[PDB]
Amino acid sequence: NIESAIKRVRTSANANAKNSSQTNAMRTAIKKFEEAVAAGADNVDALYNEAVKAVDMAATKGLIHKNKANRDKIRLSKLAK
Amino acid sequence: AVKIRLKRMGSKKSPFYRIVVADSRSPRDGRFIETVGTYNPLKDPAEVVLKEDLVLDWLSKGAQPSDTVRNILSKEGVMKKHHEAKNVK
RNA sequence: UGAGAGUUUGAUCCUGGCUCAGGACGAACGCUGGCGGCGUGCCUAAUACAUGCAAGUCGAACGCUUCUUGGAAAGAGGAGUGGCGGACGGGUGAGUAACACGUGGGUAACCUACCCAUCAGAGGGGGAUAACACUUGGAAACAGGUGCUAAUACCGCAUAACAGUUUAUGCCGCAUGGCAUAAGAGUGAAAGGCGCUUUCGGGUGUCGCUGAUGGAUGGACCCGCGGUGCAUUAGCUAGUUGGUGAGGUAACGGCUCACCAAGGCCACGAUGCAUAGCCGACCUGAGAGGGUGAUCGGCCACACUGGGACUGAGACACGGCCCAGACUCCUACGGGAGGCAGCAGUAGGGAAUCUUCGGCAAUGGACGAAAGUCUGACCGAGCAACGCCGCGUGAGUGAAGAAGGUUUUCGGAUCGUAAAACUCUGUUGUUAGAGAAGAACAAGGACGUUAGUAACUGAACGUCCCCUGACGGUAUCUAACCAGAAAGCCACGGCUAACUACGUGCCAGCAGCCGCGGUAAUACGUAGGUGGCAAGCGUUGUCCGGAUUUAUUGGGCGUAAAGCGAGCGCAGGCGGUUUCUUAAGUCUGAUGUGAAAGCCCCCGGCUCAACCGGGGAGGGUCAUUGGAAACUGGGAGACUUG
Question: At what angle do helices B67-74 and B78-85 cross, to 10 degrees?
C-alpha cells in the first residue's frame, strides 16, 4: 500500500482543481468568441484577441504542449481573421 | 542519458569484471549499444585491459562515466585526457 | 562422418508388423559418506498469504518547531510547503493465430525535460494558504471553523514570431508536396540561489528559467515476406467498402459524426472450433529434418476479477487513486481496513523441488554545492550427491600356494604376493604457525597548470598524503603426526562375456522378446564362483535414432495392402521446330544488415581441466545497385511432321 505518494495524491488533487478551472476558462473564452463570429455584429476584435490570448496563455502559462494551441490558431485565423 | 559503466562475470569466490557502455535506461548486464574494455578483479597489479578508443568518441556524444571508470582511466589519464583534450579541445 | 539382432514354416525365398543393443530425467535412490572447481533447484493451483524487508532525496527554493551548551550561535532533530523520482530495478506465462514475434523496410502523415550545440533573452506587484494557536464533530480513519505568514509555491501586465499560416520570388520532387529569401495578424520567464571584490559600489564565476533551431537517447504508426491442427468447419461483413465535408488526433485514417452509392473478403482456404506466449538457442541425425521453448539474454502481455480516468512530457500506472463484484480483519455497528505472479518464510496440491545471513566494501540505480541515505538489484555467505570439470582410498618388493573359503575321484583348481613381512610417501586427514594476500579503486580536503573577469581573492583542470573488506582466521604456504580416516552397484538359456550343490518338483513365480517350469532347471529359490561400469551405480517416464515403418534427398499398385465400372469436359498441371526481342524465373559482382554470450576453429590464462578473454567463418528463401541472355516465362513472325 501507501508509503510516501499520498503527497503526490494531494498534489494531483490540487492540480485537478486548478487545471479544471483553467481549462473551463479557456473553453468558455473560445465559445464566447465563437458566438460572435456567426452573429456578425460588433465586438469582433476584442474577444478575437482575447480568445487568442486565452489559447496562448493556457498553452504556455498553462499546458497542452504547443500544437492544439497551434491547430486552434490555424483553424481560427483561417476562419475569423 | 547515455552512460558507460561496469559488468560482472563472477563464479563463486573469484570474480571477473568488464566495463560496458550503454544507455542508463537499461539494466547493468542487460542490453547496451556497443562494447568498451574490461579489468581483472584479482592479482594486483591487475590487468588494465582497455579499448581507450571509444571513451572520447562516446563523450563527444556526451555521457557520464561512473566512479570506477574515472579513477581507473585517470590511471591511464583518459579523464585527464578528457578535460585535457576537451576543455582545451 | 550412414554396422544390424531376434521372432510367421517340417524346412525355403519374399513381403511384413513387434522387440532390443545408442544417446537428451531442468527435480522420486530404498546404498553411501571425499566433492571443499563450475552451474542448477514448484513445470501440478495465474491456489490463499501471517512475519519482517523490498523508494526515497533535497536546508545554496522556503517558512515553523524539539536538544548539548536570559541575552549566544555551530552541530543535531520534528513537521510542512515546494522540487525530482515512484512508468527504472525485480516476478509470471493467465491471455494472444495477430504486424504479438523474426527479418527487410517507410516518416513529402510522427512525438520526447532526463547530454551537449546555437541564438534571443531573462521586471515591477498582488492575494491567499499550509505550517502555526484555539475550539466544533469525531470510537477511530479523518473532517470543520477563525486569525496570522514565506518562497524557485500560486496568480494577472510590458516586451520578440525566428514557430505558424498567407503572399511574391527562385529551385526541385514519387500524387499529395518540399527547400531559401522578403513581408500582412497574437503570443514568456525563477524578476531566483550560493561565493568573491564588498569605499557609495554592483561587477560578478557558477547553479538554475523561458522561447526558437540541431545532434544524440526513448516511444509510436504503416508496409513485403516467414513459422498450426481440423473442410465429419464454405460462405462471411454494414461503420462494412468507397466518396463527400466536419469534428477529433504527436501524428494519417470511417478513429467518430452527417450525406451519396453498395461495395469488401473468399477453394491459394475467408469466417468458425481447439491448442500455444514468440525468439537467440539446445548433452538428438550421416545429412535432409524431426523434438522441446529452463537457464542466460531480447520482445510482447498480465497484477484477486471487470470498467474508468487524474497528476505527470512519458501510465490508463505491480507495493497510486474512483466505482462495480468476490473474498478476508476490526467497528463504540454509524462505518472503516487489504491484495507477496518483488526476497526469504508460511498452508494446500503433488511422483516430486531449498536459508526468514551481512553489506553497499565491488558494481548499478535515486536525489544533491557535499559528507551522504536507501536497495531481498547485486556482491557474496548458510542447504539438496541435483548434474559436469579435475583429482583421491598407498606404491616398489614379497608363497610349492599362510590359515581359511567354495568345489572335487580327494589325488587338485581358483581365491592368492593378493596375504604376512621390508623400504619409501603425504595430493590429503589431525595439530600449529606465516598469509589474511589477491579481492579497492577510491569523493573530498591542502600543494602546484588553461580562453577570458579588476582580482581561483573564490570559480570550472592537476601531483602527493588520509581513509574502509560482511564470507575473513577465507584461500594459499610452511612444519609435525600416522598407511592409518577414505568402497559401494545389477545379472549370468539365446540375442548379450559369467558355473556348480541341493530344495519346491503342472506347482510354488520368472520373463524386454523368443520363451521356462512339470525330481535330474547356467530360466522357479537359496548358497558360493564369475562379469561390466565404476561414489556413484539399478528401476520408471518422456524425446530423437535404429525406421527406406510417409521414401524431395529415399518406397510402389498382374497375383501380397494398393488403378475409381466406364466415358465427356470447366478450372488446373505439362507442351512440336524456328528468327528477332525481352529479362520475370535462373547464374554472377559490389554494398548495408543477420545483437552479445552461443557451437566449431585459431590464439591465451586459471597448477591442467571445465570457466573466462581476443579474431573471423555460420545464420538472407534479405534490401539496393551492375552485368550475363543457354534453358523456362512475356511480344512479334515462320513451318508441317502432332
Answer: 90
Contact between the CB of A21 and strand C at under 7 Å: no
Give residues 36-55 of chain B lying near strand C (Cβ < 7 A): 38, 41-44, 46, 49
Angle of the A46-57 helix axis to the A6-39 helix axis, nearest 10: 160
The Cα B62–Cα B68 span in angstroms is 18
The approach used to solve this structure was cryo-EM
Q: Where are the domains of chain B?
A: 1-89
